[PDB]
Coordinates of C-alpha atoms in Angstrom, one line a residue:
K1 CA 0.0 -0.1 0.0
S2 CA 2.1 3.0 -1.4
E3 CA 5.8 1.6 -1.9
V4 CA 6.8 5.2 -2.5
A5 CA 5.7 6.1 1.0
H6 CA 7.0 2.7 2.8
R7 CA 10.4 3.5 1.3
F8 CA 10.1 7.2 2.1
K9 CA 9.4 6.4 6.0
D10 CA 12.2 3.8 6.0
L11 CA 14.8 5.7 4.5
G12 CA 14.1 9.1 5.6
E13 CA 13.8 12.3 3.1
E14 CA 17.7 12.7 2.7
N15 CA 18.7 8.9 1.5
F16 CA 15.5 9.1 -0.3
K17 CA 16.2 12.2 -2.5
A18 CA 19.9 10.8 -2.9
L19 CA 18.7 7.7 -3.8
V20 CA 16.3 8.6 -6.4
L21 CA 18.9 11.1 -8.0
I22 CA 21.3 8.1 -8.3
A23 CA 18.7 5.9 -9.8
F24 CA 17.6 8.7 -12.5
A25 CA 21.5 9.5 -13.2
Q26 CA 22.2 6.0 -13.6
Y27 CA 19.3 5.4 -16.1
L28 CA 20.0 8.8 -18.2
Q29 CA 23.7 9.5 -17.7
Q30 CA 23.6 12.0 -20.7
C31 CA 20.9 13.8 -19.5
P32 CA 21.8 17.1 -17.5
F33 CA 21.7 17.8 -13.9
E34 CA 19.3 20.3 -12.8
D35 CA 16.7 18.5 -14.9
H36 CA 17.2 15.2 -12.6
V37 CA 17.0 17.7 -9.6
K38 CA 13.6 18.8 -10.7
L39 CA 12.4 15.3 -11.3
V40 CA 13.7 14.1 -8.2
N41 CA 12.3 17.1 -6.4
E42 CA 8.9 16.4 -8.0
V43 CA 9.0 12.7 -7.1
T44 CA 10.0 13.4 -3.5
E45 CA 7.0 15.9 -2.9
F46 CA 4.8 13.4 -4.4
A47 CA 5.7 10.9 -1.5
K48 CA 5.0 13.2 1.3
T49 CA 1.6 13.3 -0.3
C50 CA 1.8 9.6 -0.1
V51 CA 2.8 9.0 3.4
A52 CA 0.1 11.3 4.4
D53 CA -2.0 9.0 3.3
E54 CA -1.0 5.6 1.3
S55 CA -4.3 5.9 -0.7
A56 CA -4.5 9.1 -2.2
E57 CA -3.1 10.0 -5.7
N58 CA -1.5 7.2 -7.9
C59 CA 0.5 6.8 -4.9
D60 CA -0.1 3.0 -5.4
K61 CA 2.3 2.7 -8.3
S62 CA 5.2 1.0 -8.2
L63 CA 8.5 2.6 -8.2
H64 CA 9.4 1.5 -11.4
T65 CA 6.2 2.7 -12.9
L66 CA 6.8 6.1 -10.7
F67 CA 10.3 6.4 -11.6
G68 CA 10.1 5.2 -15.3
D69 CA 7.2 7.7 -16.0
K70 CA 9.2 10.4 -14.5
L71 CA 12.0 9.7 -16.8
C72 CA 10.2 9.6 -20.0
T73 CA 9.3 13.6 -19.1
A74 CA 13.7 7.1 -25.9
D75 CA 12.9 3.5 -26.8
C76 CA 9.8 4.6 -22.8
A77 CA 7.5 2.9 -25.5
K78 CA 6.6 -0.3 -23.3
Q79 CA 5.1 -1.0 -20.0
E80 CA 6.5 -2.2 -16.8
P81 CA 8.5 -4.2 -16.4
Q82 CA 10.0 -4.4 -19.9
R83 CA 10.6 -0.7 -19.9
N84 CA 12.8 -1.0 -17.0
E85 CA 14.7 -3.6 -18.8
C86 CA 15.1 -1.7 -21.9
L87 CA 18.7 -1.1 -17.6
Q88 CA 20.1 -2.8 -20.9
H89 CA 21.0 0.6 -21.9
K90 CA 23.4 1.2 -18.9
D91 CA 26.8 2.8 -20.7
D92 CA 29.9 1.5 -18.9
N93 CA 31.7 4.1 -20.7
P94 CA 29.5 7.0 -21.8
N95 CA 31.9 9.5 -23.6
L96 CA 30.8 12.4 -21.3
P97 CA 33.4 14.8 -20.3
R98 CA 36.2 13.7 -17.9
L99 CA 35.6 14.4 -14.6
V100 CA 37.5 17.6 -14.0
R101 CA 38.3 18.2 -10.2
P102 CA 39.3 22.4 -9.8
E103 CA 41.6 23.4 -6.9
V104 CA 41.2 23.5 -3.1
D105 CA 39.0 26.6 -2.9
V106 CA 37.1 27.7 -5.8
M107 CA 35.4 24.0 -4.7
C108 CA 35.6 25.4 -1.2
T109 CA 33.7 28.6 -2.2
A110 CA 31.1 26.6 -4.2
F111 CA 30.8 24.2 -1.3
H112 CA 30.4 27.0 1.5
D113 CA 27.6 28.6 -0.5
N114 CA 25.0 25.8 -1.8
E115 CA 26.3 23.2 -0.2
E116 CA 24.1 20.3 -0.7
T117 CA 23.7 21.6 -4.3
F118 CA 27.4 20.8 -4.1
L119 CA 26.9 17.5 -2.9
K120 CA 23.9 16.4 -5.1
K121 CA 26.4 17.2 -8.2
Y122 CA 28.8 14.8 -6.7
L123 CA 26.3 12.2 -6.7
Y124 CA 25.1 12.8 -9.9
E125 CA 28.8 13.0 -11.4
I126 CA 29.6 9.7 -10.2
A127 CA 26.1 7.8 -10.7
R128 CA 26.1 8.8 -14.5
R129 CA 29.7 7.5 -15.0
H130 CA 29.5 4.3 -12.6
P131 CA 25.9 3.2 -13.6
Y132 CA 26.6 0.2 -11.5
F133 CA 27.8 2.2 -8.2
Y134 CA 26.6 0.1 -5.4
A135 CA 24.1 2.9 -4.4
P136 CA 24.0 2.9 -0.5
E137 CA 27.8 2.8 -0.8
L138 CA 27.5 5.8 -2.8
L139 CA 25.8 7.7 0.0
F140 CA 28.6 6.6 2.3
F141 CA 31.0 8.3 -0.1
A142 CA 29.2 11.2 -0.2
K143 CA 28.9 11.4 3.4
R144 CA 33.0 11.1 3.8
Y145 CA 33.2 13.8 1.0
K146 CA 31.1 16.0 3.0
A147 CA 33.0 15.7 6.2
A148 CA 36.1 16.3 4.0
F149 CA 35.1 19.3 2.9
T150 CA 33.4 20.5 6.4
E151 CA 36.6 19.8 8.0
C152 CA 39.4 20.9 5.8
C153 CA 37.6 23.9 4.2
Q154 CA 38.0 25.6 7.6
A155 CA 41.6 24.5 8.4
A156 CA 44.6 26.5 8.2
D157 CA 46.1 24.8 5.1
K158 CA 43.3 23.5 3.2
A159 CA 44.9 22.1 0.6
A160 CA 47.2 20.2 2.9
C161 CA 44.0 18.6 4.6
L162 CA 41.8 18.2 1.5
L163 CA 43.5 16.8 -1.2
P164 CA 45.1 13.8 0.5
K165 CA 41.4 13.2 1.5
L166 CA 39.7 13.9 -1.8
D167 CA 42.3 11.2 -3.3
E168 CA 41.9 8.2 -0.9
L169 CA 38.4 8.6 -1.7
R170 CA 38.9 8.5 -5.5
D171 CA 40.9 5.3 -4.8
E172 CA 38.4 3.8 -2.2
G173 CA 35.5 4.7 -5.1
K174 CA 37.3 3.2 -8.1
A175 CA 37.9 0.2 -6.1
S176 CA 34.0 0.1 -4.8
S177 CA 32.7 0.6 -8.3
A178 CA 34.8 -2.1 -9.9
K179 CA 33.7 -4.7 -6.8
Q180 CA 29.9 -3.8 -7.7
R181 CA 30.5 -3.8 -11.2
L182 CA 31.4 -7.7 -10.9
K183 CA 28.6 -8.3 -8.3
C184 CA 25.9 -7.3 -10.9
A185 CA 27.8 -8.9 -14.1
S186 CA 27.6 -12.0 -12.1
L187 CA 23.9 -11.8 -11.3
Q188 CA 22.9 -10.3 -14.5
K189 CA 24.9 -12.7 -17.0
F190 CA 25.4 -16.2 -15.0
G191 CA 22.7 -15.8 -12.6
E192 CA 21.8 -15.9 -8.9
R193 CA 23.4 -19.5 -8.2
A194 CA 26.8 -18.1 -9.5
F195 CA 26.4 -15.2 -7.0
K196 CA 25.1 -17.3 -4.1
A197 CA 28.4 -19.9 -4.6
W198 CA 30.3 -16.7 -4.1
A199 CA 28.5 -15.3 -1.5
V200 CA 28.8 -18.8 0.4
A201 CA 32.6 -18.8 -0.1
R202 CA 33.2 -15.2 0.9
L203 CA 31.2 -15.2 4.1
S204 CA 32.3 -18.6 4.9
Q205 CA 36.0 -17.3 5.0
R206 CA 34.8 -14.4 6.9
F207 CA 32.7 -15.7 9.5
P208 CA 34.6 -19.4 10.0
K209 CA 32.7 -20.0 13.4
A210 CA 29.2 -19.4 11.8
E211 CA 27.2 -22.6 11.2
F212 CA 26.4 -23.2 7.8
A213 CA 22.4 -22.4 8.4
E214 CA 23.7 -19.0 9.3
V215 CA 25.7 -18.4 6.5
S216 CA 23.1 -19.2 4.1
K217 CA 20.4 -17.1 6.0
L218 CA 23.0 -14.3 5.3
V219 CA 23.6 -15.4 1.5
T220 CA 20.3 -15.1 0.6
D221 CA 19.6 -11.7 2.3
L222 CA 22.9 -10.7 0.7
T223 CA 21.6 -11.9 -2.8
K224 CA 18.5 -10.2 -2.3
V225 CA 20.3 -6.9 -1.5
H226 CA 22.4 -7.0 -4.6
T227 CA 19.6 -8.5 -7.0
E228 CA 17.7 -5.1 -6.1
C229 CA 20.6 -2.7 -6.6
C230 CA 21.8 -4.4 -9.8
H231 CA 18.2 -4.1 -11.2
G232 CA 17.3 -0.7 -10.5
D233 CA 15.6 -1.2 -7.1
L234 CA 18.1 1.6 -5.6
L235 CA 15.4 2.3 -2.5
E236 CA 14.8 -1.5 -1.6
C237 CA 18.5 -2.1 -2.0
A238 CA 19.1 0.6 0.7
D239 CA 16.3 -0.6 3.1
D240 CA 17.4 -4.2 3.1
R241 CA 21.0 -3.4 3.3
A242 CA 20.3 -1.6 6.5
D243 CA 18.1 -4.3 7.9
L244 CA 20.8 -7.0 7.1
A245 CA 23.2 -4.7 8.8
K246 CA 21.0 -4.5 12.0
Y247 CA 20.2 -8.3 11.8
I248 CA 23.9 -9.1 11.5
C249 CA 24.7 -6.6 14.6
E250 CA 21.8 -8.4 16.5
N251 CA 22.9 -11.8 15.8
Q252 CA 26.6 -10.8 16.6
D253 CA 27.9 -13.7 18.8
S254 CA 26.4 -16.1 16.2
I255 CA 28.6 -15.0 13.4
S256 CA 31.9 -13.5 14.2
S257 CA 33.9 -11.8 16.9
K258 CA 34.9 -8.6 15.6
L259 CA 31.7 -7.0 14.1
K260 CA 31.4 -5.4 17.6
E261 CA 34.1 -3.3 16.5
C262 CA 31.7 -1.5 14.3
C263 CA 28.2 -2.6 15.2
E264 CA 28.0 0.6 17.1
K265 CA 28.2 3.1 14.1
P266 CA 25.7 5.2 12.3
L267 CA 24.0 3.1 9.2
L268 CA 26.3 3.8 6.4
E269 CA 29.4 3.7 8.3
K270 CA 28.2 0.5 9.9
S271 CA 27.2 -1.5 6.7
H272 CA 30.3 -0.4 5.3
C273 CA 32.4 -1.6 8.4
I274 CA 30.7 -5.0 7.9
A275 CA 31.5 -6.0 4.5
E276 CA 35.1 -4.8 5.2
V277 CA 35.6 -6.8 8.5
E278 CA 38.3 -9.2 9.3
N279 CA 37.5 -12.8 9.1
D280 CA 37.6 -13.9 12.9
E281 CA 40.0 -16.7 13.8
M282 CA 38.4 -20.2 12.8
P283 CA 37.7 -22.8 15.3
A284 CA 41.0 -24.2 17.3
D285 CA 40.7 -27.8 15.7
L286 CA 38.2 -29.3 12.9
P287 CA 38.0 -32.2 11.3
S288 CA 39.6 -33.3 7.8
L289 CA 36.7 -33.2 5.3
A290 CA 37.6 -36.2 3.5
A291 CA 35.9 -38.1 6.6
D292 CA 32.6 -36.2 5.7
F293 CA 33.0 -35.6 1.6
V294 CA 35.1 -38.9 0.3
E295 CA 35.1 -41.6 2.5
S296 CA 31.9 -41.8 4.1
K297 CA 29.2 -44.0 2.2
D298 CA 26.5 -41.4 2.8
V299 CA 27.8 -38.8 0.0
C300 CA 26.8 -39.8 -3.4
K301 CA 23.2 -40.2 -2.2
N302 CA 23.7 -37.0 -0.1
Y303 CA 24.9 -35.2 -3.6
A304 CA 21.6 -36.5 -4.5
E305 CA 19.9 -35.7 -1.4
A306 CA 20.6 -32.1 -1.3
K307 CA 22.8 -31.3 -4.4
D308 CA 23.1 -27.7 -4.0
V309 CA 23.2 -27.5 0.1
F310 CA 25.7 -30.3 0.4
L311 CA 27.7 -28.7 -2.4
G312 CA 26.9 -25.5 -0.4
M313 CA 28.7 -26.2 2.7
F314 CA 31.5 -28.2 1.2
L315 CA 32.3 -24.9 0.0
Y316 CA 31.3 -23.5 3.2
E317 CA 33.8 -26.3 4.9
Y318 CA 36.8 -25.5 2.6
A319 CA 36.3 -21.8 2.7
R320 CA 36.0 -21.5 6.1
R321 CA 39.3 -23.6 6.8
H322 CA 41.0 -21.5 3.8
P323 CA 41.1 -17.7 4.4
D324 CA 44.5 -18.2 2.4
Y325 CA 42.8 -19.4 -0.7
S326 CA 41.2 -16.6 -3.1
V327 CA 37.5 -16.8 -3.4
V328 CA 37.9 -17.9 -7.4
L329 CA 40.4 -20.9 -6.4
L330 CA 37.7 -21.9 -3.5
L331 CA 35.0 -21.8 -6.5
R332 CA 37.2 -23.5 -8.8
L333 CA 37.9 -26.2 -6.1
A334 CA 34.1 -26.9 -5.7
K335 CA 32.9 -26.8 -8.9
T336 CA 35.5 -29.3 -10.0
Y337 CA 34.3 -31.6 -7.0
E338 CA 30.8 -31.3 -8.8
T339 CA 32.1 -32.3 -12.1
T340 CA 33.5 -35.4 -10.4
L341 CA 30.6 -36.6 -8.8
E342 CA 28.2 -35.5 -11.7
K343 CA 29.6 -38.6 -13.6
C344 CA 31.3 -40.9 -11.0
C345 CA 28.3 -42.1 -8.9
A346 CA 26.8 -42.5 -12.4
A347 CA 29.4 -45.2 -13.3
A348 CA 29.4 -48.6 -11.7
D349 CA 31.1 -48.3 -8.8
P350 CA 30.8 -44.7 -7.4
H351 CA 33.5 -44.5 -4.8
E352 CA 36.3 -45.9 -6.6
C353 CA 35.7 -43.2 -9.2
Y354 CA 36.3 -40.6 -6.6
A355 CA 39.4 -41.0 -4.5
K356 CA 41.0 -38.4 -7.0
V357 CA 39.0 -35.3 -5.5
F358 CA 41.5 -33.7 -2.9
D359 CA 44.7 -34.3 -5.1
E360 CA 42.9 -33.0 -7.9
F361 CA 42.9 -29.9 -6.1
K362 CA 46.6 -29.6 -5.7
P363 CA 47.6 -28.3 -9.1
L364 CA 44.5 -26.0 -9.1
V365 CA 46.1 -24.7 -5.7
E366 CA 49.5 -24.8 -7.2
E367 CA 49.1 -22.3 -10.4
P368 CA 47.5 -19.4 -9.0
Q369 CA 50.1 -19.5 -6.0
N370 CA 52.9 -19.9 -8.5
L371 CA 51.7 -17.1 -10.6
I372 CA 51.2 -14.6 -7.6
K373 CA 54.7 -15.3 -6.3
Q374 CA 56.2 -14.9 -9.9
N375 CA 54.2 -11.7 -10.6
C376 CA 55.3 -10.2 -7.1
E377 CA 59.1 -11.0 -7.6
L378 CA 58.8 -8.8 -11.0
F379 CA 56.7 -6.0 -9.1
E380 CA 59.4 -6.4 -6.3
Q381 CA 62.1 -5.2 -8.9
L382 CA 60.3 -3.1 -11.4
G383 CA 58.2 -1.2 -9.0
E384 CA 54.6 0.1 -10.1
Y385 CA 54.8 1.8 -13.7
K386 CA 57.8 -0.3 -14.9
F387 CA 55.5 -3.3 -13.7
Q388 CA 52.5 -1.7 -15.4
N389 CA 54.6 -1.2 -18.7
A390 CA 55.6 -5.1 -18.5
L391 CA 51.6 -6.1 -18.2
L392 CA 51.1 -3.7 -21.0
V393 CA 53.4 -5.5 -23.6
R394 CA 52.1 -8.6 -22.5
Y395 CA 48.5 -8.1 -22.6
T396 CA 48.8 -5.8 -25.6
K397 CA 50.5 -8.7 -27.6
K398 CA 47.7 -11.0 -26.0
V399 CA 44.5 -9.0 -27.4
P400 CA 46.2 -6.6 -29.9
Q401 CA 42.7 -5.9 -31.3
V402 CA 41.3 -4.2 -28.3
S403 CA 41.1 -0.4 -27.9
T404 CA 44.0 1.0 -26.7
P405 CA 42.3 3.4 -23.9
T406 CA 41.0 0.1 -22.5
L407 CA 44.5 -1.5 -22.9
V408 CA 46.0 1.1 -21.0
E409 CA 43.3 1.5 -17.9
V410 CA 43.0 -2.2 -17.7
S411 CA 46.7 -2.7 -17.5
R412 CA 47.7 -0.2 -15.1
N413 CA 44.8 -1.4 -12.9
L414 CA 46.7 -4.9 -13.4
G415 CA 49.9 -3.3 -12.3
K416 CA 48.0 -1.8 -9.3
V417 CA 47.5 -5.6 -7.8
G418 CA 51.3 -5.4 -7.3
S419 CA 51.6 -2.6 -4.7
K420 CA 48.6 -3.4 -3.0
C421 CA 48.9 -7.4 -2.2
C422 CA 52.7 -7.9 -2.5
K423 CA 53.2 -6.0 0.6
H424 CA 51.2 -8.6 2.3
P425 CA 52.6 -11.9 3.8
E426 CA 52.3 -14.8 1.4
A427 CA 49.4 -16.4 3.5
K428 CA 47.5 -13.4 2.6
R429 CA 48.6 -12.7 -0.9
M430 CA 46.4 -14.8 -2.8
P431 CA 42.7 -14.0 -2.2
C432 CA 44.1 -10.5 -2.4
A433 CA 45.7 -11.0 -5.6
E434 CA 43.5 -13.6 -7.8
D435 CA 40.2 -11.8 -6.5
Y436 CA 41.5 -8.4 -7.6
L437 CA 42.5 -9.8 -10.9
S438 CA 39.1 -11.2 -11.3
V439 CA 37.5 -7.6 -10.7
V440 CA 40.0 -5.8 -13.0
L441 CA 39.5 -8.5 -15.7
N442 CA 35.7 -8.0 -15.5
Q443 CA 36.5 -4.3 -16.2
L444 CA 38.2 -5.5 -19.5
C445 CA 35.2 -7.9 -20.2
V446 CA 32.4 -5.2 -19.7
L447 CA 34.4 -2.4 -21.6
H448 CA 34.9 -5.2 -24.3
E449 CA 31.0 -6.1 -24.6
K450 CA 30.2 -2.8 -25.8
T451 CA 32.3 -2.4 -28.8
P452 CA 33.7 -5.9 -29.4
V453 CA 37.0 -6.3 -31.3
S454 CA 38.6 -9.6 -30.2
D455 CA 36.8 -12.8 -29.8
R456 CA 39.5 -14.3 -27.7
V457 CA 38.6 -11.7 -25.0
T458 CA 34.5 -12.5 -25.7
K459 CA 35.4 -16.2 -25.3
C460 CA 37.2 -16.0 -21.8
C461 CA 34.7 -13.4 -20.8
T462 CA 31.5 -15.4 -21.8
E463 CA 32.7 -18.6 -21.1
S464 CA 33.0 -18.7 -17.4
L465 CA 33.1 -16.4 -14.2
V466 CA 35.6 -18.4 -12.1
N467 CA 37.9 -18.9 -15.3
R468 CA 38.4 -15.8 -16.5
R469 CA 41.6 -15.1 -15.0
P470 CA 43.0 -18.7 -15.8
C471 CA 41.7 -18.4 -19.4
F472 CA 43.3 -14.9 -19.8
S473 CA 46.8 -15.5 -18.4
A474 CA 47.1 -18.7 -20.4
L475 CA 46.4 -16.8 -24.0
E476 CA 49.8 -15.1 -25.5
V477 CA 50.7 -13.5 -28.8
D478 CA 47.7 -13.2 -31.4
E479 CA 49.9 -14.4 -34.2
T480 CA 47.0 -13.4 -36.2
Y481 CA 47.1 -9.7 -35.5
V482 CA 48.2 -7.9 -38.6
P483 CA 50.4 -4.9 -37.6
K484 CA 48.7 -1.7 -37.2
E485 CA 49.2 1.0 -40.0
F486 CA 52.2 2.9 -39.0
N487 CA 51.2 6.7 -38.1
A488 CA 53.7 9.2 -37.0
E489 CA 51.9 11.5 -34.9
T490 CA 50.6 8.5 -32.8
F491 CA 53.9 9.6 -31.3
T492 CA 55.3 13.1 -31.7
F493 CA 54.7 14.7 -28.6
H494 CA 53.9 18.2 -27.8
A495 CA 55.3 20.2 -25.1
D496 CA 51.8 20.1 -23.1
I497 CA 53.2 16.7 -21.8
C498 CA 55.7 18.8 -19.1
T499 CA 52.5 20.5 -17.5
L500 CA 50.3 17.6 -17.5
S501 CA 52.7 15.9 -15.0
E502 CA 53.5 12.6 -13.0
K503 CA 50.5 10.6 -13.7
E504 CA 48.9 11.8 -16.9
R505 CA 52.4 11.9 -18.3
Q506 CA 52.6 8.1 -17.7
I507 CA 49.3 7.8 -19.4
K508 CA 50.5 9.1 -22.4
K509 CA 54.1 7.5 -22.6
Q510 CA 52.1 4.2 -21.6
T511 CA 49.6 4.9 -24.6
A512 CA 52.3 5.2 -26.9
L513 CA 53.6 2.0 -25.8
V514 CA 50.5 0.4 -26.7
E515 CA 50.3 1.4 -30.4
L516 CA 54.3 0.7 -30.7
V517 CA 53.6 -2.6 -29.6
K518 CA 50.4 -2.6 -31.9
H519 CA 52.7 -1.7 -34.7
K520 CA 55.4 -4.1 -34.3
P521 CA 53.7 -7.1 -32.1
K522 CA 56.9 -9.1 -32.4
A523 CA 59.7 -7.0 -31.1
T524 CA 61.4 -8.2 -27.7
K525 CA 60.6 -6.9 -24.3
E526 CA 64.1 -5.7 -24.2
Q527 CA 63.7 -3.5 -27.4
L528 CA 60.4 -2.3 -26.2
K529 CA 62.2 -1.0 -23.2
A530 CA 64.9 0.2 -25.2
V531 CA 62.6 2.6 -27.0
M532 CA 60.4 3.6 -24.2
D533 CA 63.2 4.3 -22.2
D534 CA 64.3 6.8 -25.0
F535 CA 60.9 8.4 -24.7
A536 CA 61.4 8.8 -21.0
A537 CA 64.7 10.9 -21.7
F538 CA 63.1 12.5 -24.6
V539 CA 60.4 14.1 -22.8
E540 CA 62.4 14.9 -19.6
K541 CA 65.0 17.0 -21.3
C542 CA 62.8 18.5 -23.9
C543 CA 60.6 19.6 -20.8
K544 CA 63.8 21.1 -19.4
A545 CA 64.0 23.0 -22.5
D546 CA 63.4 26.4 -23.6
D547 CA 62.1 24.7 -26.8
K548 CA 59.4 27.0 -28.2
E549 CA 57.8 23.5 -28.8
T550 CA 60.7 23.0 -31.1
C551 CA 62.7 20.4 -29.2
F552 CA 59.7 18.1 -29.2
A553 CA 59.1 18.5 -32.9
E554 CA 62.6 18.5 -34.5
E555 CA 63.8 15.8 -31.7
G556 CA 60.6 14.3 -32.6
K557 CA 60.9 12.8 -35.7
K558 CA 64.7 12.0 -35.5
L559 CA 63.5 9.9 -32.5
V560 CA 60.4 9.0 -34.6
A561 CA 62.4 7.7 -37.4
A562 CA 65.4 6.4 -35.5
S563 CA 63.5 4.5 -33.1
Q564 CA 61.4 2.9 -35.9
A565 CA 63.7 -0.1 -37.2
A566 CA 62.2 -2.1 -34.5

């Protein structure tokens, strides 16, 4: 009886307005801002009228009916739910302007003036450029953003205060968005059972003491919340997240030993602290699992008595006991335990078919461990950027047909796993690294689905979720790729490079590295580094030059032609 009233009371007006703004921006993206504010301001004024009597105007419409109708103020021609669907139009790289951040006081001025116009714009600008951003999490970033301007716009050194805060949020925000973009992709492209299994593994790691009935409780709730979020039901998502959080904090001695740290915090901070909480220590001693999963004459019938459940806490039992395994690995191990029993009890004698099942795991366990140890050592000597450059040539040769911008971003995010995970002890490195790889590889997956150009990317992306990273790291040089036409002002460089500093300077160099590798796809690592290093000395001293742009121009093609050859 009026859903708009129901969510307006549960969420309250501020989270209400912020959420529908986010919903509108994630559905329109290209539409301007004070249009969306009109539309959300109107939607909220009608809602107040609905709480005042839930049997009033068209207060009975569904949220999608209401919100979809408001937006249509183009292909709006269909009825609910299928209008909602046509959601299938969310642009994952809309080519709106890049988000330009001014300096530490023309932003302070606009914030100190009309400050929550300033904050509705922050929401709108993230929302439209991250159309799957976990919406209640975005309220939390908004709150942290606000606290950053509150406290440092009045500090003595405002830039010494705000900028290291505005930048940590940018890093958290990019990581958040990518995290959520994978949770949606699984639900939307591989179904809820894919998402359930991942949820089982992750929560089983993190609440090792919980019994299976509790984690499965938690899993269905978390599946409910992210299903709603990934399908536009932003208000219901926010409400159920907040319910799940209070439910978690009540039943606290029943799940884990360190939620208490944050079950005492305001809603947004609380649910954000949950979802990032440390795993608590697993029980002191716990049996092997061969006793219950391979040796017992109970299990082939059990795999026929409770297929998904029995799989479910084999997963729960292996995960609970292996915080050092990535989620993808745990998932790989259990889906190959499943494959095993799918055709073994199908044979004459079930048990002698499966004795395999725990030793089959070791090379599946070996290979990621080998990879991370290996890729860390390279990072541990190259450092980020040089590492990034190694991955650049590697992945560019792998999929030379993909967009150069995509290659560049995907590869430096790949390089970022070095500086995040290798600082960890090797018992902690593996979930850290392979699950972060999974997120970054999904970014390349969805970016590629838009303007597909390489079917080997398509194959790994569409084939599996859990098998993306091994599928990807198993490819090498295309051999089928015809070297791209040589264009000389794919290089050149202009003197603007000297002002556009540190990081964007690396982006430009790394871009040139990509279309260098695209042009000479068979050319040694040593050679590509040879020529890239001469770029880094060519930019450095041309920047320290009184060129009149000239340095870059004439020592340009003299290091464009001379650095051709290879």
